Amino acid sequence: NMKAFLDELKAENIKKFLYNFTQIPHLAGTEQNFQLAKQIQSQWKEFGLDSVELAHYDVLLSYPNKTHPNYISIINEDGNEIFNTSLFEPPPPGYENVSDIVPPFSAFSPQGMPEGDLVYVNYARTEDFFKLERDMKINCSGKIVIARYGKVFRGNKVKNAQLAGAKGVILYSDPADYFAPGVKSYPDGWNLPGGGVQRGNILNLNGAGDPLTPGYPANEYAYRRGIAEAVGLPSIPVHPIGYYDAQKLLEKMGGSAPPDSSWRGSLKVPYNVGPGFSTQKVKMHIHSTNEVTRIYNVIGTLRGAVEPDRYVILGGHRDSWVFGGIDPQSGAAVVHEIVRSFGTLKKEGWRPRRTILFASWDAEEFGLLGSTEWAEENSRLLQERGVAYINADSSIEGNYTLRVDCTPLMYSLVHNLTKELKSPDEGFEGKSLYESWTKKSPSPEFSGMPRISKLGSGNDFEVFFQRLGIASGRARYTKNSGYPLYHSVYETYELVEKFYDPMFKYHLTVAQVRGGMVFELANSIVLPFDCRDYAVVLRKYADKIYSISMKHPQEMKTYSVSFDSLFSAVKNFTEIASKFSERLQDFDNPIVLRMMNDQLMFLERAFIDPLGLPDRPFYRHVIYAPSSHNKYAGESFPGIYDALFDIESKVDPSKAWGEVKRQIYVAAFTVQAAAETLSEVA
Amino acid sequence: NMKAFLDELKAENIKKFLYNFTQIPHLAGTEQNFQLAKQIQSQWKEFGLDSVELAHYDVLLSYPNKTHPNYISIINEDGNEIFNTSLFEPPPPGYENVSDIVPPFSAFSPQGMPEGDLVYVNYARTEDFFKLERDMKINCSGKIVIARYGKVFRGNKVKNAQLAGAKGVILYSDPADYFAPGVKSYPDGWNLPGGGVQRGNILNLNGAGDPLTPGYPANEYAYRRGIAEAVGLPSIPVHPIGYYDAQKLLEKMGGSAPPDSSWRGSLKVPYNVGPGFSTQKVKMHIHSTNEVTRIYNVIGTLRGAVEPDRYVILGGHRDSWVFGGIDPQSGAAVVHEIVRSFGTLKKEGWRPRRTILFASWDAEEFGLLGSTEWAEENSRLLQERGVAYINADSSIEGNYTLRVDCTPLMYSLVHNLTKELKSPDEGFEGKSLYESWTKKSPSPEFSGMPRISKLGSGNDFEVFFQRLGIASGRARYTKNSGYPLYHSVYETYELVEKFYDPMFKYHLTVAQVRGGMVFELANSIVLPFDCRDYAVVLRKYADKIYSISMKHPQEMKTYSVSFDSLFSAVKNFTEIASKFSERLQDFDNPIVLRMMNDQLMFLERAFIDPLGLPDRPFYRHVIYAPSSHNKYAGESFPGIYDALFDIESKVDPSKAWGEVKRQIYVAAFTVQAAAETLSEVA
Ligand SMILES: *[C@@H]1O[C@H](CO)[C@@H](O[C@@H]2O[C@H](CO)[C@@H](O[C@@H]3O[C@H](CO)[C@@H](O)[C@H](O[C@H]4O[C@H](CO)[C@@H](O)[C@H](O)[C@@H]4O)[C@@H]3O)[C@H](O)[C@H]2NC(C)=O)[C@H](O)[C@H]1NC(C)=O
Ligand SMILES: *[C@@H]1O[C@H](CO)[C@@H](O[C@@H]2O[C@H](CO)[C@@H](O[C@@H]3O[C@H](CO)[C@@H](O)[C@H](O[C@H]4O[C@H](CO)[C@@H](O)[C@H](O)[C@@H]4O)[C@@H]3O)[C@H](O)[C@H]2NC(C)=O)[C@H](O)[C@H]1NC(C)=O
Ligand SMILES: *[C@@H]1O[C@H](CO)[C@@H](O[C@@H]2O[C@H](CO)[C@@H](O)[C@H](O)[C@H]2NC(C)=O)[C@H](O)[C@H]1NC(C)=O
Ligand SMILES: *[C@@H]1O[C@H](CO)[C@@H](O[C@@H]2O[C@H](CO)[C@@H](O)[C@H](O)[C@H]2NC(C)=O)[C@H](O)[C@H]1NC(C)=O
Ligand SMILES: *[C@@H]1O[C@H](CO)[C@@H](O[C@@H]2O[C@H](CO)[C@@H](O)[C@H](O)[C@H]2NC(C)=O)[C@H](O)[C@H]1NC(C)=O
Ligand SMILES: *[C@@H]1O[C@H](CO)[C@@H](O[C@@H]2O[C@H](CO)[C@@H](O)[C@H](O)[C@H]2NC(C)=O)[C@H](O)[C@H]1NC(C)=O
Ligand SMILES: O=C(O)CC[C@H](CP(=O)(O)Cc1ccc(I)cc1)C(=O)O
Ligand SMILES: O=C(O)CC[C@H](CP(=O)(O)Cc1ccc(I)cc1)C(=O)O
Ligand SMILES: *[C@@H]1O[C@H](CO)[C@@H](O)[C@H](O)[C@H]1NC(C)=O
Ligand SMILES: *[C@@H]1O[C@H](CO)[C@@H](O)[C@H](O)[C@H]1NC(C)=O
Ligand SMILES: *[C@@H]1O[C@H](CO)[C@@H](O)[C@H](O)[C@H]1NC(C)=O
Ligand SMILES: *[C@@H]1O[C@H](CO)[C@@H](O)[C@H](O)[C@H]1NC(C)=O
Ligand SMILES: *[C@@H]1O[C@H](CO)[C@@H](O)[C@H](O)[C@H]1NC(C)=O
Ligand SMILES: *[C@@H]1O[C@H](CO)[C@@H](O)[C@H](O)[C@H]1NC(C)=O
Ligand SMILES: *[C@@H]1O[C@H](CO)[C@@H](O)[C@H](O)[C@H]1NC(C)=O
Ligand SMILES: *[C@@H]1O[C@H](CO)[C@@H](O)[C@H](O)[C@H]1NC(C)=O
Ligand SMILES: [Ca+2]
């Protein structure tokens, strides 16, 4: 039973897998990551799973030229390079003889050597640019922008810069965002040194997966787009730097002063916006290449005893920018011990009711490529058989409390499960995870319950949830800016053991939460989804988008913009979902059981519109999508939200409001249609 | 049991329903068709079905202006109308006091009064135009074209004319295509009189349904496209005429002579191609309007006893251009008696295993609007629950032999069923339908078996099969040019009773074929689909498209165009489908049964690509689509076919061949993926 599963998980095992996964870099497309995949495949076979396979794809990746390093320069009038940025990060103690630490670089930057004047754009958010162009009347065209990391996904920053006319982007880590007060730099604390740099891709894929093969798996016979038709690639060069290098670039900044304090970091510089310094310019040198490279997912199967054609999936990535001490090996080590523990019951003669699939995804760091291509290959099986997807990237971002993001269909399952688990928090010994989680992170929606956020993107659940409509969830420990050492060489096992989780108790709790969700999904007779929870949030989301529109009362009058159809649909959903729940509590018959479970499994599916959202065909869920301004954040009724965004600035109001009304219709229709899936079937 | 069902069907009942359905016109959007829908709904309730509902939609229809008739004129230099075409068809005997016979018109023609010189374009097929432009070097730009009806759907003719620069189209019925030798004109035989005209829509919808609401049902709150963004509407005026009127227009034709005999009809005219006569011109007067009008489908439910969440659908249209004696009431009367007969067993305490839905669709004549909108509304239920769709338009086109078009998944079911039925054919008394059907219509694919054709479009199965991937089939009696009186006022009950089927025995046989297919689908424990039949045709289709490409050996060398991946996939499908069939013959367990039946139900589904075919998003089946040159005809591997079509004429070969190779990949992938749905599930 579940307790047997849960008691078998050990903090010590997790510790030792983490150690094992973090001694050398495991960059996607490298032989080191192929050999770690082969290791995981033998171990999962030894641990007891029925079959364990590699699935490979040939996808577009990006790497620096080893003989031709990327860097940025201040040049004087004569064209002399008077300051050059660092070529690599100072390695941490004990790691100086490690080969193949990829130098800091922005994956998928095009090649180039632009020189120009700098403008400073704060976080390069959509609103940052509005301020610059609209309020300050600064023009970024033909300028190189420098922007600090933080707040939004880096790909969005680059997209906004490109839209604004920039010809280069420089990203840096500001100590105000990546240096927590009162703690030391690595290795004596967990802060980012002035020499540390954040690697990361800067694509704008919008769910496409491999840039060359949107819609279709990048297998051996795949037809590939030419690079100039590739999806999501940036057209201006980009590179990241540490804050010692950044101070040199910013210290000379002239032109206009920062519009306000929100624009100032914590370096000793004026944070002037530019443009320009006075005869000195900036010059970038980027020589990275894009190359089609083979990647490898590991797929493990534990066959269900009763419904082997019903799939519960636990997945997370294995590739890392360098050592991956938190991101992702802290998640991967937890998956490994969950597989061990399931395989232990299996060996005692137990099987789950439903089939469980376990995945170690490749190339997540380069745009969720491994998960996406596998799902493109297997989409028919997933869509008619996929019960749920539980993600398993990093178990920790912090040591304060639990963080859960999921579909409303799982809200009750998580509430129940966390009441059965003990808190590991200091001061809550003998109290439940639910109790500590809800004191420390209370819902702002109401009640004596914990906050649960919306799924956005930036992780491997995206294809499952936003493209295919499979109920998905994730959980990890978090802090009270992500963590300072994110994607730097300094993110090591030692960082985790010394400063995050010395006793591996937080890891163990996250392993219990993830493992328990999976166990219930795979073995409970009736699926543990509550459709009434979707009815409640649909109403809150409708109220919200309604409020946004009501900022424009005159336009709503002129163009007759009614939300009545959406509210009607949400009422209908609320009433039908109540009746189904009654029927759920009132039946005996396995065909009936299977019919009702199918109704539950398909309800997430019902929110998918096969035409997709406007200009984003692979985002097909009508209720949720990644924010168009920040891939990491979820937005509700995305179609209507984006139609209303900045609408006072469009030239043809009647066309713009026409499209608002069209999206209201699409939403109202899709809510009604989803509701009807829960009606009596004949 | 089945025999009980089949014995309950009566030829006499069919006769009397036909009579009842054909005494007044039932044009879509008219009150007469609404009242026939209300009648059908009460009767189906009385006949015993569990529930019977109307589903309504507000869709774009088209009607002539009652105070401003459409016509064509020869005008002299002074602008005098020296000849005018007929304003209505001479009514048949006994029908002269019937109100509301819509005059001959091309539904959805735009308004206009173009005058110009005539070019004669034969059937206005794609190859007709190639001949004119390429061989004969005639330019149709700014000309009015006149084309005879036949060979291809009329919408295609209009699309080709429009592409060729025409500014008007005149369609006529040539006696060579609509006057069978040795038989008299109505009312003394079944031929078309010189005064008869073929009504019909001329849209190019490509599966969109209602022109204003592609993707979404045209319900009460629907957001509608403006007419200028409407899908599928023609941009040049169009009108049809009889052959007495046509002779007047053709008799004066000058310019170039017909390129060959295939271009000559059976009128006493030279069939000169034009352009022009000599100072006389042609002038059209079209004043028809498009209007959003409510339509009504009748939906009947007979709940399944064991799997009520599995839907077998029998459907056909009810709307007619005028009386609808063959098209569609000859089908509708057969559905009515099938419903009576099922409801009779129901009343004796019987239920089918699976739910049966019965539909009387509206507005089929105006572009399959009623079926399409209902499926757009219910697409989630259909896609996860839809076992099969059996269409039921006209039961007869002729009195010679059976004609069946269906997915290969039903080939065995139809072979078996027709061996259990008696032939009604003269000279085959005491022999089986299978025997008569296969002597008279032998497969050209090989064997001592009957011909079964591919599904194309031009009927209500299109949304079910090509958009949603639900296994579909149809059957009717046919002739050894469709039937002469198609869509004219002369298509009456009397036509059927006197000349087609005096004893209603052909009707009864078609009722047995349709009814029996439905009965087996709804009640058999294991679904009566044979996946090995799909493996055999996939190989034939691959050979075929391969042969087409091999007309271009040099290009295949230069661009490296290999079909190896498609042949590999078809081999894989063949082998996996064999194993599944073995497993199908070897299991006991209802979850197992339900899993295997789901694998069978989903196999048609697997051929759907959610991105659709190029430039046709609502045609999503990769194996079949309506021919791009003739909506009535099915084409196999449509994506590759169209990429190869006329490819020697494209300007950039490497791009054109690139796209061939892309479609080979898409096909090969989709066959492999469909195959994998029939693999062991874990
Ligand atoms: C939520 O569920 C409810 C059912 O509980 C569902 O209610 C439906 O609302 C529609 C309106 O959107 C009703 O439609 C009416 O049907 C009758 C039938 O004759 C017509 O009389 C009405 O049309 C008249 O009025 C119209 C107003 O302009 C005219 O245009 C029209 O020509 C007629 O004069 C109208 O069609 C429908 O009957 C109910 N269904 C019920 C209660 O059976 C509601 O739509 C659901 N919400 C959503 C978003 O789906
Ligand atoms: C029909 O089903 C069969 C299985 O019965 C399936 O066979 C598969 O074919 C692919 C080739 O398309 C095989 O792929 C190989 O896998 C090995 C693993 O290391 C590689 O060595 C091969 O790659 C080498 O050669 C390549 C050639 O260019 C190089 O590019 C590459 O870098 C390597 O040098 C290749 O990937 C695959 O293993 C089999 N599967 C089996 C038998 O397990 C076939 O593809 C199916 N047909 C379709 C259309 O799906
Ligand atoms: C991580 O753990 C694994 C397995 O416990 C180690 O891999 C094994 O290494 C030994 C000795 O080199 C070999 O004999 C085995 O074949 C390996 N087993 C495999 C690949 O499953 C591995 O060396 C550990 N890595 C580190 C850095 O400690
Ligand atoms: C979470 O737990 C609660 C309490 O056990 C469950 O709610 C009960 O479910 C049982 C079993 O069907 C009912 O008899 C009770 O009436 C329910 N109490 C309620 C409605 O508060 C709930 O089902 C659980 N949710 C899951 C497992 O998803
Ligand atoms: C077609 O058949 C139907 C039903 O047998 C006839 O409709 C009925 O007509 C009678 C007399 O007018 C009414 O009392 C009933 O209410 C009708 N029943 C219905 C609508 O179900 C109908 O008149 C026949 N039509 C023709 C042209 O013969
Ligand atoms: C059509 O009928 C044939 C002959 O009855 C069926 O083929 C047999 O099916 C039975 C039942 O499973 C097997 O035991 C035999 O070996 C089959 N004979 C063969 C393969 O020729 C066939 O299943 C029927 N097809 C249907 C119902 O779709
Ligand atoms: O291409 C993407 O969508 C995101 C790629 C990658 C995903 P990640 O694995 O690093 C996200 C992440 C960040 C912090 C933590 I703790 C866990 C996961 C990123 O650069 O954001
Ligand atoms: O819009 C369409 O796709 C077709 C509409 C209509 C369909 P139909 O019902 O008349 C097709 C048809 C023709 C002959 C016969 I016998 C049965 C059915 C047509 O004009 O072709
Ligand atoms: C690295 O840079 C130089 C100059 O082109 C050369 O060694 C080689 O071309 C580069 N490697 C690449 C582009 O893969
Ligand atoms: C920057 O690097 C370039 C290229 O190696 C070199 O010419 C220049 O002197 C360097 N500048 C400094 C200040 O080291
Ligand atoms: C930004 O400057 C460029 C330089 O030519 C100009 O063309 C562009 O329109 C400017 N942005 C504004 C003010 O529209
Ligand atoms: C771990 O827990 C303590 C207790 O609040 C906290 O102060 C410390 O900063 C935490 N570690 C990290 C890296 O957040
Ligand atoms: C029919 O034609 C005339 C002229 O416009 C007039 O009676 C009326 O406008 C027309 N009806 C329409 C366009 O619906
Ligand atoms: C054709 O009809 C028009 C409009 O009614 C009329 O002016 C003309 O005389 C008619 N021609 C003939 C030959 O009847
Ligand atoms: C057909 O004639 C028109 C009339 O201007 C011309 O422009 C067009 O190009 C012609 N077709 C050919 C020969 O391309
Ligand atoms: C009905 O059957 C006879 C026998 O062959 C045939 O000659 C006759 O033309 C048929 N009727 C029609 C309308 O085809
Ligand atoms: Ca792909």
Ligand SMILES: [Ca+2]
């Ligand atoms: Ca529609």
Ligand SMILES: [Cl-]
């Ligand atoms: Cl996660």
Ligand SMILES: [Cl-]
């Ligand atoms: Cl039919």
Ligand SMILES: [Zn+2]
């Ligand atoms: Zn990462």
Ligand SMILES: [Zn+2]
């Ligand atoms: Zn990660």
Ligand SMILES: [Zn+2]
């Ligand atoms: Zn018709």
Ligand SMILES: [Zn+2]
């Ligand atoms: Zn018809």
